[PDB]
Amino acid sequence: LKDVVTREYTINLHKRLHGVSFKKRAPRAVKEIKKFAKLHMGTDDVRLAPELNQAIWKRGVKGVEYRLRLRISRKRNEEEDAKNPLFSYVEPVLVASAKGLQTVVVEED
Amino acid sequence: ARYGATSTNPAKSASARGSYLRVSFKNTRETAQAINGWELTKAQKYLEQVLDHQRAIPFRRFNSSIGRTAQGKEFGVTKARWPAKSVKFVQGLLQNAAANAEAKGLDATKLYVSHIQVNQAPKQRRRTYRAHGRINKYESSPSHIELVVTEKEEAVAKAAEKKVVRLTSRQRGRIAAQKRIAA
Amino acid sequence: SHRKYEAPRHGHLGFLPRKRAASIRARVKAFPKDDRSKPVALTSFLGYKAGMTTIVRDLDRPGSKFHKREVVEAVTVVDTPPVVVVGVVGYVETPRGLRSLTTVWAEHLSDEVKRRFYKNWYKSKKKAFTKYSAKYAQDGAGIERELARIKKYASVVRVLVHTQIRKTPLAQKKAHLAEIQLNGGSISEKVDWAREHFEKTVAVDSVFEQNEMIDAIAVTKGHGFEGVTHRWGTKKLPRKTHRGLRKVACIGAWHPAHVMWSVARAGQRGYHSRTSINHKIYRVGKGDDEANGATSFDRTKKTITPMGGFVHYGEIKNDFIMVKGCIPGNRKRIVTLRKSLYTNTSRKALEEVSLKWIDTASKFGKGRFQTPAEKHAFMGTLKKDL
Amino acid sequence: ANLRTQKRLAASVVGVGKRKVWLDPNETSEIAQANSRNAIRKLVKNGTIVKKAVTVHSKSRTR
RNA sequence: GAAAUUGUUGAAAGGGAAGGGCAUUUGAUCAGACA
RNA sequence: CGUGGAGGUCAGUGACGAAGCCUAGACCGUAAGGUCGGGUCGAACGGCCUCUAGUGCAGAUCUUGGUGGUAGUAGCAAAUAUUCAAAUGAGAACUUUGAAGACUGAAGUGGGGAAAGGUUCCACGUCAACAGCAGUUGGACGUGGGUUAGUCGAUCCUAAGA
RNA sequence: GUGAACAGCCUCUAGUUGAUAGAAUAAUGUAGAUAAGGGAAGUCGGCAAAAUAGAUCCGUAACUUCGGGAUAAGGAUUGGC
Ligand SMILES: [Mg+2]
Ligand SMILES: [Mg+2]
Ligand SMILES: [Mg+2]
Ligand SMILES: [Mg+2]
Ligand SMILES: [Mg+2]
Ligand SMILES: [Mg+2]
Ligand SMILES: [Mg+2]
Ligand SMILES: [Mg+2]
Ligand SMILES: [Mg+2]
Ligand SMILES: [Mg+2]
Ligand SMILES: [Mg+2]
Ligand SMILES: [Mg+2]
Ligand SMILES: [Mg+2]
Ligand SMILES: [Mg+2]
Ligand SMILES: [Mg+2]
Ligand SMILES: [Mg+2]
Ligand SMILES: [Mg+2]
Ligand SMILES: [Mg+2]
Ligand SMILES: [Mg+2]
Ligand SMILES: [Mg+2]
Ligand SMILES: [Mg+2]
Ligand SMILES: [Mg+2]
Ligand SMILES: [Mg+2]
Ligand SMILES: [Mg+2]
Ligand SMILES: [Mg+2]
Ligand SMILES: [Mg+2]
Ligand SMILES: [Mg+2]
Ligand SMILES: [Mg+2]
Ligand SMILES: [Mg+2]
Ligand SMILES: [Mg+2]
Ligand SMILES: [Mg+2]
Ligand SMILES: [Mg+2]
Ligand SMILES: [Mg+2]
Ligand SMILES: [Mg+2]
Ligand SMILES: [Mg+2]
Ligand SMILES: [Mg+2]
Ligand SMILES: [Mg+2]
Ligand SMILES: [Mg+2]
Ligand SMILES: [Mg+2]
Ligand SMILES: [Mg+2]
Ligand SMILES: [Mg+2]
Ligand SMILES: [Mg+2]
Ligand SMILES: [Mg+2]
Ligand SMILES: [Mg+2]
Ligand SMILES: [Mg+2]
Ligand SMILES: [Mg+2]
Ligand SMILES: [Mg+2]
Ligand SMILES: [Mg+2]
Ligand SMILES: [Mg+2]
Ligand SMILES: [Mg+2]
Ligand SMILES: [Mg+2]
Ligand SMILES: [Mg+2]
Ligand SMILES: [Mg+2]
Ligand SMILES: [Mg+2]
Ligand SMILES: [Mg+2]
Ligand SMILES: [Mg+2]
Ligand SMILES: [Mg+2]
Ligand SMILES: [Mg+2]
Ligand SMILES: [Mg+2]
Ligand SMILES: [Mg+2]
Ligand SMILES: [Mg+2]
Ligand SMILES: [Mg+2]
Ligand SMILES: [Mg+2]
Ligand SMILES: [Mg+2]
Ligand SMILES: [Mg+2]
Ligand SMILES: [Mg+2]
Ligand SMILES: [Mg+2]
Ligand SMILES: [Mg+2]
Ligand SMILES: [Mg+2]
Ligand SMILES: [Mg+2]
Ligand SMILES: [Mg+2]
Ligand SMILES: [Mg+2]
Ligand SMILES: [Mg+2]
Ligand SMILES: [Mg+2]
After folding, report:
1. Which of the residues bear the PTM Phosphoserine (chain D)?
2. Of C236, C217, C213, which Cα lies nearest the Cα of C21?
3. Which of A1, B140, C253, C291 is the one with CA 20 to 30 A from C46?
């Protein structure tokens, strides 16, 4: 079936970005994250909160933080019906340190 | 009309053209033949996958110095590509043909693609500037695409000549005597 | 005209073509000459290269400036858990050469080997050998006559063994299977040995001893498409030269008007098969043995596994072969270790080593401590700890 | 939809370079209608177009 | 609405060119003459 | 032998299909060539005796046009750099808007002029071509609007010179 | 702002964010760097590259048209508070 979940994840950008040419780091990150969502949610359709976008670019192109604490929300799709009924919205969580958290499920209401 | 050579019951067929289209003649040749003869429905699913880089189009003539890909294994082939603009145009006509078959009242379930032919439309000349004050042709090489779908039909029954046998005097002597002797 | 100055060519034509090998598992192109007086055993063994460490030992070489002085020497370690016997195969002599005439297989077969017979295990119905297994049912009839046949003919006999890769830190699950010639005496004694060991399990110590010179057959590390200058160690061309300098200036005279097989050209490098000889066994380790990497002289209990573990490999929890120096292939590669094809007198071979100390500090950095115990000793107490 | 002209107009009306006019995305249909300077002027008056602040270059570390 | 040159269909052949000459097999195809 | 045109002639052929073109179908000639069938076509045309010449092509780095192999190949890599979302639209990597990340760094990627262009300005509509990907965008395409002086220039004066 | 400075480097105002795009990072390249010990043995030739550099002080040869040569050469110094 579907499922509709929200969880909160920490992604290791650092090794995903290891090596990447400086002018492509913040961009690879965007993409690398999108990938991270489909891997966990199964979902091709992955959208990024403009806030999350800001969190990524917060230090310039090549200054992407080593760990981000995402919140990924699998949601049903609407209007002109895309290929799949499901998509994912990713958003930044407002955490003090992103270091040290395992992955949790967010209770839905 | 007046399409290319066909051999097919027009009462059980439908057709579509595109002419003067601005797609690479060479690439859409290659993609037209990937489709050629396929079950209409199998073909539409197939181009869709092409577009997804999940199956590929086997490049068989217009193909020197082309990439190699595992996605040609299926077709016995190492060189294969995913020529998007072609596909989208070719399925554009496939779509049209379907509609025409629907309109004719042909059974969609039996539709195979029986004729698909591309050849060369008039070229379109732009131009480019080469070193030392020279100019060079820069040319669009566009296509005419044409296809024909048909309802698949079984059998063929038999019927032919009867072979008029001719044999000499000594030849129907063996024969005559063969039964007079044996069975 | 004529060279001008003479120089040896660049590199060895005896290793051509310099293409990628047909398999990861280099082939034993020859086995030790058979002496049918000795008891039966293998003549090779499968293993995986773990890595290298350093050794300190005294030298016994009367005449050398370093006679009776310590030397330090590099050694490699290959992970060597018991191979398991799953079949025999008998060859016969023909005027067209040696041909295989039957392969007899053991009734049960580990998933490890069974896995080798496949490219898509998870989806597959695992039907391999499931009819063959049935040949045991009827009293034994069919298997015997094969065995029986082997004995009657068969000029040589090789055993089908495979590795217990699960006893190994590798991911790769798919075990390695291979023919090992069987030199202990008498064709008939040979297959009896083989038949007997079916599904049973064979150990390294039953094949190799300390100080023995062995050979190592393996597929070399790969480097991909490679320019002429490093692939052949051609001279760099001068700095002034148009369109590149890691090249060869003259790829040939004008006649033969043909580039020739004997000149250096860019291409694949590495992933070549190599048969390397005269590596000496400095240690035959035993898995079930703390103080693996301890010594007569060291004492201090510890295995050969470096702190933090063999970089890029893992841990070593099985018997192992310690061989002095370096060896074809890289860490994690399947390697065949082979009995030498001649009895070397050498002096160099014959020397009966005995380690004093086996390094065990981390290879992941400039390691300073053999053991956590040592490190804890020297550092004092830290903010974590008790 | 295409608010370039209203952007430029915005700049000129307010006395500020275009790098500082703000056209809010949520009143996009209303803004487009604004073809004139009198129209932009009303739009500026009621906050559909705002001036956007200067970017600080503080003399504090100089001082 | 020729030709170069092209797509499709049908038939054939092809172990580092192809095309040609004498001759016949084999396939395809056809005129004439019998009365 | 074959072509274009001319005199004579066969009361020649033809819209019930002239000419032309196509055709590993037929027949005559050693050959130049000639004749027929079928297909395509659509308004003219040929046999014979003579007359006549801008009369016969494989070449001339021949002329003009058209066309290939090369080849979906060389390539589309200078000028630091882009990103998230919304809106619109058949269609959005590229349009609009918001956000963010940067750049030019007042010796400017700012604000104006001279020469030169001549409508490129501006609005609306809008994508067939063009902008060596794209395109819903444009200095493109369509249709309109727009350049206000006693004081700013010219106009007057003189320069080399004409 | 730094600084001798209309230099270079960073910023405000203004203006841009145009330059086909995606994925990989083989050989060979173009452009940017580093390399133990030796130090021109390389090469037609030190070509290329490296070294030097600002300021304050000290010190400064031959020779000369007495003006120079001269930043000769050679040295020390330099932050923050
Ligand atoms: Mg790197
Ligand atoms: Mg047409
Ligand atoms: Mg071709
Ligand atoms: Mg071709
Ligand atoms: Mg290429
Ligand atoms: Mg080629
Ligand atoms: Mg290629
Ligand atoms: Mg892939
Ligand atoms: Mg192929
Ligand atoms: Mg050019
Ligand atoms: Mg020019
Ligand atoms: Mg008879
Ligand atoms: Mg010589
Ligand atoms: Mg192979
Ligand atoms: Mg047999
Ligand atoms: Mg290299
Ligand atoms: Mg060398
Ligand atoms: Mg080497
Ligand atoms: Mg040069
Ligand atoms: Mg060389
Ligand atoms: Mg016409
Ligand atoms: Mg044929
Ligand atoms: Mg013949
Ligand atoms: Mg004549
Ligand atoms: Mg004439
Ligand atoms: Mg004439
Ligand atoms: Mg022909
Ligand atoms: Mg005839
Ligand atoms: Mg006719
Ligand atoms: Mg006619
Ligand atoms: Mg007419
Ligand atoms: Mg005449
Ligand atoms: Mg002439
Ligand atoms: Mg001629
Ligand atoms: Mg000609
Ligand atoms: Mg000639
Ligand atoms: Mg010519
Ligand atoms: Mg031409
Ligand atoms: Mg193309
Ligand atoms: Mg290319
Ligand atoms: Mg280039
Ligand atoms: Mg750029
Ligand atoms: Mg862009
Ligand atoms: Mg934007
Ligand atoms: Mg700057
Ligand atoms: Mg400046
Ligand atoms: Mg510009
Ligand atoms: Mg102006
Ligand atoms: Mg102009
Ligand atoms: Mg106008
Ligand atoms: Mg305009
Ligand atoms: Mg268009
Ligand atoms: Mg233009
Ligand atoms: Mg374009
Ligand atoms: Mg276009
Ligand atoms: Mg206009
Ligand atoms: Mg005045
Ligand atoms: Mg006046
Ligand atoms: Mg401007
Ligand atoms: Mg460009
Ligand atoms: Mg690119
Ligand atoms: Mg890699
Ligand atoms: Mg050095
Ligand atoms: Mg020195
Ligand atoms: Mg010298
Ligand atoms: Mg010297
Ligand atoms: Mg020399
Ligand atoms: Mg010289
Ligand atoms: Mg010299
Ligand atoms: Mg120099
Ligand atoms: Mg240095
Ligand atoms: Mg001087
Ligand atoms: Mg001097
Ligand atoms: Mg001080």
Report:
1. 29, 36
2. C217
3. C291
